[PDB]
Amino acid sequence: DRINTVRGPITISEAGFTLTHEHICGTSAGFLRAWPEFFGSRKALVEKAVRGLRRARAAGVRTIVDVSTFDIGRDVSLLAEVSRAADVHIVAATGLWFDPPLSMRLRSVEELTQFFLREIQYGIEDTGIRAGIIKVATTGKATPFQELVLRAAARASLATGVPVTTHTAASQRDGEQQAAIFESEGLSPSRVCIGHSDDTDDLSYLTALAARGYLIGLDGIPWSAIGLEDNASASALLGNRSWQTRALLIKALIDQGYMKQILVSNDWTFGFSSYVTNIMDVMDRVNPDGMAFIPLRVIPFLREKGVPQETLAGITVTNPARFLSPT
Amino acid sequence: DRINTVRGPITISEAGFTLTHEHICGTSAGFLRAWPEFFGSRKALVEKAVRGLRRARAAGVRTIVDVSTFDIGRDVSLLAEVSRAADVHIVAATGLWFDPPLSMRLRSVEELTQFFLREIQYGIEDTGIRAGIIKVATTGKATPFQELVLRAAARASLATGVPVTTHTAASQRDGEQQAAIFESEGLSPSRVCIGHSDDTDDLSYLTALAARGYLIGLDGIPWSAIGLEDNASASALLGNRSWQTRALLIKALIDQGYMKQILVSNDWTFGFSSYVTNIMDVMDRVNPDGMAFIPLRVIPFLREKGVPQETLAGITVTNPARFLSPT
Numbered sequence: 152d153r154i155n156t157v158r159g160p161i162t163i164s165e166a167g168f169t170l171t172h173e174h175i176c177g178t179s180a181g182f183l184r185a186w187p188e189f190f191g192s193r194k195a196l197v198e199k200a201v202r203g204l205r206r207a208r209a210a211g212v213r214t215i216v217d218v219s220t221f222d223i224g225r226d227v228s229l230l231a232e233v234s235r236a237a238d239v240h241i242v243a244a245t246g247l248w249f250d251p252p253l254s255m256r257l258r259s260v261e262e263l264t265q266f267f268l269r270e271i272q273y274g275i276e277d278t279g280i281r282a283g284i285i286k287v288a289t290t291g292k293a294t295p296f297q298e299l300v301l302r303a304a305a306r307a308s309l310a311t312g313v314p315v316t317t318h319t320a321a322s323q324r325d326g327e328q329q330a331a332i333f334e335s336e337g338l339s340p341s342r343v344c345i346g347h348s349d350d351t352d353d354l355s356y357l358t359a360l361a362a363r364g365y366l367i368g369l370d371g372i373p374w375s376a377i378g379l380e381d382n383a384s385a386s387a388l389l390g391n392r393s394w395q396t397r398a399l400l401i402k403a404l405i406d407q408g409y410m411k412q413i414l415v416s417n418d419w420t421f422g423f424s425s426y427v428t429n430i431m432d433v434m435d436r437v438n439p440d441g442m443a444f445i446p447l448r449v450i451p452f453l454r455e456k457g458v459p460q461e462t463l464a465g466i467t468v469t470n471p472a473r474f475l476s477p478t
Numbered sequence: 479d480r481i482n483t484v485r486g487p488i489t490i491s492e493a494g495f496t497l498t499h500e501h502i503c504g505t506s507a508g509f510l511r512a513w514p515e516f517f518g519s520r521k522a523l524v525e526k527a528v529r530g531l532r533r534a535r536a537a538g539v540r541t542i543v544d545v546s547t548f549d550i551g552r553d554v555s556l557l558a559e560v561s562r563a564a565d566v567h568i569v570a571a572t573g574l575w576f577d578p579p580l581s582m583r584l585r586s587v588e589e590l591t592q593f594f595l596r597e598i599q600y601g602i603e604d605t606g607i608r609a610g611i612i613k614v615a616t617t618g619k620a621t622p623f624q625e626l627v628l629r630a631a632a633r634a635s636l637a638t639g640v641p642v643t644t645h646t647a648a649s650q651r652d653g654e655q656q657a658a659i660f661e662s663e664g665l666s667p668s669r670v671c672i673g674h675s676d677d678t679d680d681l682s683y684l685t686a687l688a689a690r691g692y693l694i695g696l697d698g699i700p701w702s703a704i705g706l707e708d709n710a711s712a713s714a715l716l717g718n719r720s721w722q723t724r725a726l727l728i729k730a731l732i733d734q735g736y737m738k739q740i741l742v743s744n745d746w747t748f749g750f751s752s753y754v755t756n757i758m759d760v761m762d763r764v765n766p767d768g769m770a771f772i773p774l775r776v777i778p779f780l781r782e783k784g785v786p787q788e789t790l791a792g793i794t795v796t797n798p799a800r801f802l803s804p805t
């Protein structure tokens with residue numbers, strides 16, 4: 152009923168339309184403070200983020216969950232500033248993604264548990280801002296360290312009730328390995344979202360996880376490099392599957408009785424330094440709507456395909472509410 | 479005429495006895511701010527660092543060059559606080575070591591040149607504290623990215639006059655490849671220190687580089703894991719060669735007429751998170767003197783072996799002053 156946001160505790164009824172997997176900035180630990188000029192300036196990044204979230208709010212969005220971890224360069228002070236200026240609730244994250252520095256990668260499962268617990272129970276850095284979600288990641292078969300992160304995430308979740316959201320290489324069916332590891336720790340499937348699931352057309356994989364109680368993250372609907380096959384870097388990241396094909400997976404899962412298991416988002420950002428230099432400009436040209444892509448283009452598309460507004464309201468309001476609530 | 483420290487510009491004479499390769503904290507970008515409890519607390523680390531530097535000061539040290547780069551988790555505000563309370567000048571560093579995150583590893587030579595220049599000319603983060611040295615690294619044959627860092631370092635040094643200091647896998651003769659890359663950029667050998675040179679006994683390698691005008695960094699004299707062969711992690715880090723063996727390389731270069739090419743240090747720290755958890759405790763047990771090891775143990779050892787006082791004063795005061803001075 153009460154979740155932690157970057158502005159403090161709010162009631163779950165106030166969350167409303169929620170985008171479950173977003174980023175204010177896709178960067179690296181300490182990078183934004185050390186080289187803000189990469190993004191023009193910190194002020195330019197703040198202004199871009201505020202304009203984007205205000206446009207998303209005008210379109211219907213009330214809350215975004217920033218799944219940026221320590222290693223994605225999460226700066227909660229930036230999240231707080233943007234949240235207040237745009238009047239959009241932002242849920243901060245803990246956990247580790249696939250670029251942890253030596254000081255993180257050499258740690259034991261017990262040490263990582265205390266770090267994730269510190270960020271949820273005490274606060275992130277010296278801000279007092281508490282995390283409301285744990286972000287973990289695997290890119291194919293889990294490395295010994297990634298297995299420790301998954302276990303530590305599960306132990307932190309059981310102690311606080313806070314949910315776990317994942318990054319997967321969906322074509323490699325990573326969700327199954329993640330699921331098995333979470334369940335070996337006693338974590339309930341209802342507290343986990345298997346993300347980047349829209350990167351695959353394998354419905355047998357998605358429905359099986361959904362049947363076990365897992366939340367399915369169809370979280371990168373506008374990600375498409377169709378038309379830009381000459382740009383090798385944009386093709387490798389955005390993929391060659393259309394926004395429509397990704398959006399039709401939402402309909403496919405509703406039609407198989409799993410409307411309560413779907414979580415939708417854009418996996419968008421306002422700053423991107425962890426890849427090639429031109430990537431943010433390339434991405435903004437592909438999708439000028441940004442985070443507003445879900446209520447402006449995806450919801451009307453699904454209404455046109457036959458999905459009722461009540462089901463779409465259930466996926467964007469009711470589902471994230473149940474997922475984010477500490478249980 | 480003036481060297482930039484964490485407390486502002488100082489004259490050449492104010493530098494005095496200088497330790498050319500040290501660290502206040504050996505960590506990772508953003509780590510100290512995100513998990514200060516790893517070091518007990520930030521207050522505990524500051525207090526330990528201030529005591530250790532005051533110990534070094536009473537023994538003769540007036541300046542240390544903290545070669546902690548962005549990726550070693552350099553926190554210039556921590557450096558400034560410790561410097562003020564201990565009354566020991568600290569020269570901060572720019573550059574990149576062997577743990578760059580995605581946002582750094584994906585950058586071009588031009589972009590990295592602008593980052594290093596920003597840290598020398600403008601300042602580090604939002605502190606206004608300017609770096610007075612560029613730290614780079616290779617661990618065997620240079621990787622494509624490490625070659626870009628060395629080139630960017632050379633271009634940054636040529637525009638500012640600030641020197642370059644390196645980390646080497648000395649047994650692999652890395653200094654020769656580093657030298658070839660620096661010289662191809664038009665960088666003068668007198669502006670470069672080939673560090674970790676005390677990790678090898680190959681005198682023909684050290685003398686050839688010294689004859690070419692390079693400064694030889696015999697920078698980790700107390701590093702020895704003799705007596706603790708049971709500790710796999712400490713053995714792989716510190717090595718099996720004695721401090722005496724490392725210190726006899728200073729005498730060996732003085733005997734072959736390269737007194738002017740020697741830079742001595744401890745490569746010590748007060749906090750260490752980029753390795754195994756108990757490493758700082760193990761290191762403090764091996765060498766309780768810390769940064770005071772050079773004037774308390776190495777200087778009297780060399781005095782007993784036949785090296786005169788004016789020669790040792792030349793290595794510890796004159797050589798660093800000439801190296802650090804922007805030329």
Ligand SMILES: CP(=O)(O)OC1CCCCC1
Nearest residue numbers: 174176177223318418420
């Ligand atoms: C490879 P991944 O989909 O995690 O990349 C993310 C893209 C959005 C910013 C954070 C990184």
Ligand SMILES: CP(=O)(O)OC1CCCCC1
Nearest residue numbers: 501503504505550645747
């Ligand atoms: C031999 P290496 O430079 O990796 O070890 C250092 C120890 C002090 C902190 C920075 C790292």
Ligand SMILES: [Co+2]
Nearest residue numbers: 317318319347
């Ligand atoms: Co991801």
Ligand SMILES: [Co+2]
Nearest residue numbers: 172174218418
């Ligand atoms: Co993401």
Ligand SMILES: [Co+2]
Nearest residue numbers: 644645646674
């Ligand atoms: Co080193």
Ligand SMILES: [Co+2]
Nearest residue numbers: 499501545745
């Ligand atoms: Co060092």
